[PDB]
Paper text:
Despite this very high degree of overall similarity, a functionally important region of domain 3a adopts somewhat different conformations in the two Vps33 monomers. The positioning of domain 1 in Vps33 is substantially different from that observed in all previously determined SM protein structures. For example, after domains 2 and 3 of the two independent copies of monomeric Vps33 are superimposed, the two copies of domain 1 differ by only a 2.2° rotation and a 0.6 Å translation. Our Vps33 structure, the first of a class II SM protein, makes it clear why Vps33 is unable to bind N-peptides. This analysis reveals that the binding site normally occupied by the N-peptide’s conserved Arg side chain is, uniquely in the case of Vps33, filled by Arg-115 of the SM protein itself. In this case a displacement of the Vps33 backbone, relative to other SM proteins, causes the side chain of Leu-129 to occupy the binding pocket. Thus, both of the pockets that in other SM proteins accommodate conserved Qa-SNARE N-peptide residues are missing in Vps33.
Vps33 regulates fusion in the endo-lysosomal membrane system as a stable subunit within two large multisubunit tethering complexes, HOPS (homotypic fusion and vacuolar protein sorting) and CORVET (class C core vacuole/endosome tethering). Following the nomenclature introduced by Misura et al., Vps33 contains three domains: domain 1 (residues 1–138; red), domain 2 (residues 139–248 and 502–667; green), and domain 3 (residues 249–501; blue), with domain 3 further subdivided into 3a (residues 249–380) and 3b (residues 381–501).
Author numbering: 5 to 212, 223 to 276, 296 to 338, 344 to 546, 556 to 582, 600 to 654
């Protein structure tokens, strides 16, 4: 009766395959490198072959073949870069003749004016048959939908491109068209508010036949800028650390070849593996113990004491898969264990946990300087400086100038750009800057965009949970060993008020809706608080504009398990983000 992630995949594959069915004959396929990964989430390469794909090409390789007269470009239309690349590629192909003279472009999801103009301005516009592929959300898991806009953090927060926000609201409207209006549109933050506004004005346009869902409870929209502190921190879940040290993209990562046990190899990382399903959301401290329990259960099943010989060989493939999974994750865990034992890592964690806990950030000054002396990697130092700034309402000017110098001398003068970019993103500011001040009620004002108050909210939303036990956690704070992501505490102000009241005020009636009971507190997080009513169990879509971490996902699944009876939780996002990705946005954007 309600939403299911599998229908998004089916529609996506159907939509793509139909367009491939419109290009009659076999065809060559040119794809934006970044789109290639997410496309694999909805269709298998073997399937594309069955629909006439002779060869596959990455647009950026600039080496499209001749073997087939049909050429198909698949790329994002919002990208200024792609419009040029495709035009260049058509002209370069046309003049290496007589090769392949039937061009198609599938723009994702929408044809833009800028793109149509570039093609015409290059002359090739009357040569390509242009379609539109309405792919928005890619379902990475049953409970995780992603726009897979890996540059959207930079695009939105640095470059001020509104496109990620527009695309997210269209994706969200799509769901309303199929399952009814979200009864409630709830959220925090300037960009999340704009998502609501665009959802509103889109509805208003349709009335020119759409009713509240019977199967959807609400949509909660968190704006990532409300809480930079969470991504800056080192993630301490299993998947979180795999992301921190190896990097996860399209449900995959690359690891040294010795790790897979027979350059580096690619490994799949999703819920189809029974073991990873149990490991990914666990605090890394209990992973060794989880592996041990699995290995033991495995040894026990093997030892659990004709034509059962042929039964054995049929079961042979399932035995390697389990074995291979256990072997690979044991090897990864041992790798991460090594990393987390170094003095640099222990020193890092210490400064992060102190700042997070609320120690005077000046008391961490000598530690930070020592981290620079030891040449710890640039992204890790920058993430500390940002945490410092973001958590304490800016850095003391005199310390800022010192840190600024250490960074430039230690890692290179080019990083003056990096720091200016961190300044534009408002994660590296002096206390003397008006933009740096956190929200208070004794705050006078100024402040069009006053910042989240972590000093106040640490207490009021109980960001620090000293007691949490990682072996059978009782609180989302487990994802950072004692620290609770603010973003998800905000989701809890809506979804688990009984519980949240229980651990902050007492006497946790508290099963009604909106931000009731938390409005004055949530006023101290950045941007607008909103709650808009539009006039089996139900799904709550929890949405992040500007990126979610694997730790927030783990914490959301934790809550999902507790809320199992009453709700289903579906996580939506413009992309999956982490601390390193944010620093890269600042480093690489000239």
């Amino acid at each position: 009766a309600g939403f299911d992630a599998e229908q998004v995949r089916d529609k996506a594959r159907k939509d793509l395959l139909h367009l491939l069915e419109g290009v009659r004959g076999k065809k060559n396929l040119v794809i934006e490198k970044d789109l290639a990964g997410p496309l694999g989430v909805i269709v298998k390469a073997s399937t594309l072959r069955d629909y006439g794909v002779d060869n596959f090409f990455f647009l950026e390789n600039k080496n499209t073949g001749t073997s087939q007269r049909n050429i198909v470009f698949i790329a994002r239309g919002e990208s200024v870069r792609n419009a040029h690349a495709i035009a260049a590629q058509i002209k370069r192909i046309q003049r290496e003749s007589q090769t392949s003279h039937d061009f198609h472009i599938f723009w994702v999801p929408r044809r833009t004016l800028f793109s149509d103009k570039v093609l015409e301005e290059a002359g090739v516009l009357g040569d390509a048959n242009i379609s539109e592929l309405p792919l928005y959300f890619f379902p990475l898991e049953r409970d995780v939908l992603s726009l897979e806009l890996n540059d959207s953090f930079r695009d939105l927060y640095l470059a001020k491109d509104p496109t990620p926000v527009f695309l997210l609201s269209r994706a969200l409207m799509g769901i309303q068209k199929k399952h009814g209006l979200f009864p409630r549109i709830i959220g925090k933050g300037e960009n999340a508010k704009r998502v609501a506004d665009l959802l509103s004005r889109m509805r208003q346009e349709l009335l020119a036949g759409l009713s509240p869902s019977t199967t959807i409870e609400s949509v909660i929209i968190i704006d990532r800028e409300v809480d930079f502190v969470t991504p800056l921190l080192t993630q301490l879940t299993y998947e979180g650390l795999i992301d921190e040290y190896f990097g996860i993209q399209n449900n995959q990562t690359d690891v040294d070849a010795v790790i897979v046990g027979a350059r580096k190899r690619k490994i799949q990382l999703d819920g189809s593996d029974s073991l990873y399903s149990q490991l990914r959301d666990a605090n890394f401290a209990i992973v060794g113990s989880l592996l041990n329990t699995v290995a033991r259960r495995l040894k026990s099943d093997y030892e659990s004491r004709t034509a059962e010989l042929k039964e054995f060989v049929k079961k042979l493939p399932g035995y390697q898969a389990e074995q291979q999974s256990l072997k690979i994750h044991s090897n990864i865990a041992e790798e991460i264990i090594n990393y987390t034992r170094t003095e640099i890592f222990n020193k890092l964690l210490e400064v992060q946990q102190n700042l997070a806990a609320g120690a005077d950030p000046s008391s961490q000054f000598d530690s930070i300087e020592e981290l620079v002396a030891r040449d710890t990697p640039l992204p890790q130092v920058l993430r500390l400086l940002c945490l410092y700034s973001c958590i304490s309402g800016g850095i003391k000017t005199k310390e800022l100038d010192h840190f600024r110098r250490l960074v430039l001398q230690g890692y290179g003068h080019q990083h003056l750009l990096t720091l200016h970019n961190l300044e534009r993103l408002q994660m590296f500011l002096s206390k003397s800057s008006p933009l740096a001040s956190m929200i208070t009620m004794s705050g006078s004002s100024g402040g069009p965009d006053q910042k989240t108050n972590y000093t106040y909210l640490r207490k009021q939303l109980r960001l620090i949970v000293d007691e949490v036990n990682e072996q059978d956690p009782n609180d989302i704070a487990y994802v950072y060993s004692g620290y609770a992501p603010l973003s998800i505490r905000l989701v809890q102000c809506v979804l688990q008020k009984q519980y949240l009241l229980s651990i902050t005020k007492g006497s946790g009636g508290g099963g009604a809706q909106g931000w009731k009971g938390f409005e004055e507190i949530v006023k101290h997080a950045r941007g607008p608080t909103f709650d808009e009513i539009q006039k089996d169990k139900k799904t709550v879509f929890v949405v992040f504009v500007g990126g979610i971490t694997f730790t927030e996902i783990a914490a959301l699944r934790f809550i999902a398990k507790q809320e199992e009876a009453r709700r289903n939780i579906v996580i939506c996002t413009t992309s999956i983000i982490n601390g390193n990705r944010m620093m890269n946005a600042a480093i690489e954007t000239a």
